[PDB]
Each structure stands twice: as structure tokens, then as C-alpha cells.
Amino acid sequence: SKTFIKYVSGIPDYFKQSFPEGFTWERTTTYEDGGFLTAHQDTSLDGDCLVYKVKILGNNFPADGPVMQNKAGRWEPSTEIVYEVDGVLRGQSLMALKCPGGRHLTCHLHTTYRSKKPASALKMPGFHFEDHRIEIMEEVEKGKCYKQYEAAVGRYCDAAPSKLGHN
């Protein structure tokens, strides 16, 4: 839901620039215990409302693992690196699912974001980070209804500055 990012430091906003047409994204997430989760998404604007259409294919999750046992804890916050490739945007991130027994089950996201505007109508962002805080606020109904919060920030590495004038 990439329209909702706070960009700082003058970083161009690939997602907001893509309206009214919208954008798509495609992703494969690899889990360290063998699962894969692949998704495709279309984002459009219907009058005043953003509309998402999502297709998902997941496989190879171990039967005895936290995911298929439904014995996961929560996502740590994560940081994605985002940069231009092939005239569109690539993202990658490591995410970590806290799980019972002091375990972290990690995964690696490989994403392509594709504006529906031509690349010539767009101001492309340089390499940067996108922090994502994703929280399940409540499991309203076991296995049937969830509430999920996200806060996201697009930024450079401000904590450890360059000595060469680099972002």
C-alpha cells in the first residue's frame, strides 16, 4: 500500500507521481525455512478511493514451521532498499518474524514497482531506504478478520553520514 509513505530529504515519490493512472508491483518473498510467497498487485484510483487487486501464490512452507502451525508472533520493523533498475523501481528487504522460543524467522523480499505513467513523465528517486512498521492491531476473529497498521518513511541513512557528500 505504497501510496502511504512519508518521504523526507526531497526524495521523489514514485507512487504519488503515478496518479491518476496508478501502478503495479510484483514480489517474491523467500523464507529461510523454505517457504515462498509470490504476489502481484494492481493499484488504481476509482474516483476518491484507492483500489487494490491482489493475486498470491505461496508454497513450500514446512508443515511443522511457525507459518503453517499458525504460531507466529509479530513482525519486527523492516528497512527496504529502493533503487532504479530497467527504467522502473526495484526494492529488496529483510524481514524478521518473531516466533515463540526466542526465534526469529527471517525472509528476503524481491520487488519490482511499475508506474503506469511512462518513465519520461516521472522524476525517479535515487537509491534510498524505506522503513516499514507493520503491526497486527487485533485479530478480530481467529483466522477470519484482522486489523493491520503500517507506518512508512522514505529516507537516506541520516544516522551515519558520508564524508564524501553522498546521500
Binding site: S1, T3, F4, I5, K6, K16, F19, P20, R27, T29, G35, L37, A39, Q41, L45, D48, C49, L50, V51, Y52, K53, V54, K55, I56, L57, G58, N59, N60, F61, P66, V67, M68, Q69, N70, K71, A72, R74, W75, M95, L97, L109, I134, I136, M137, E139, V140, E141, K142, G143, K144, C145, Y146, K147, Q148, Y149, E150, A151, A152, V153
Partner: protein, 59 residues
């Protein structure tokens, strides 16, 4: 075309480890502040036989 508060709606269809499911969702956020919240409902294939967490980045 964007506003300081915007609603969104989603439809999700998938199969995970052979398990078919479909969801709908509705949310609202502040695009410029970078915050949002949504409610996702499983309409087919519930209750899900896996951790919802694996769907978090797709909603």
C-alpha cells in the same frame, strides 16, 4: 488527485500450500504522513490454516 486522508479497498485471491482463500479489505490513511490502517476479512477459505503474517505485505 491525492488528498490528506484517503480511503482504500482491496480484493485478494490466493493459494498457499494448496489452500485457496479470498479476502476483501477496507482502510484509510494519510498518504503524506505515511500512516494507514485496514481491516481484512477472509470471505472464502476461512479460518486460514496459516499465519496471517505472510499476507501482511500484500494487503
Amino acid at each position: 488527485f491525492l488528498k490528506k486522508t484517503m480511503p482504500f479497498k482491496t480484493t485478494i485471491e490466493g493459494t498457499v500450500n494448496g489452500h485457496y482463500f479470498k479476502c476483501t479489505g477496507k482502510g484509510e490513511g494519510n498518504p503524506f504522513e505515511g500512516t494507514q490502517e485496514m481491516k481484512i476479512e477472509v470471505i472464502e477459505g476461512g479460518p486460514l490454516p496459516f499465519a496471517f503474517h505472510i499476507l501482511s505485505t500484500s494487503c
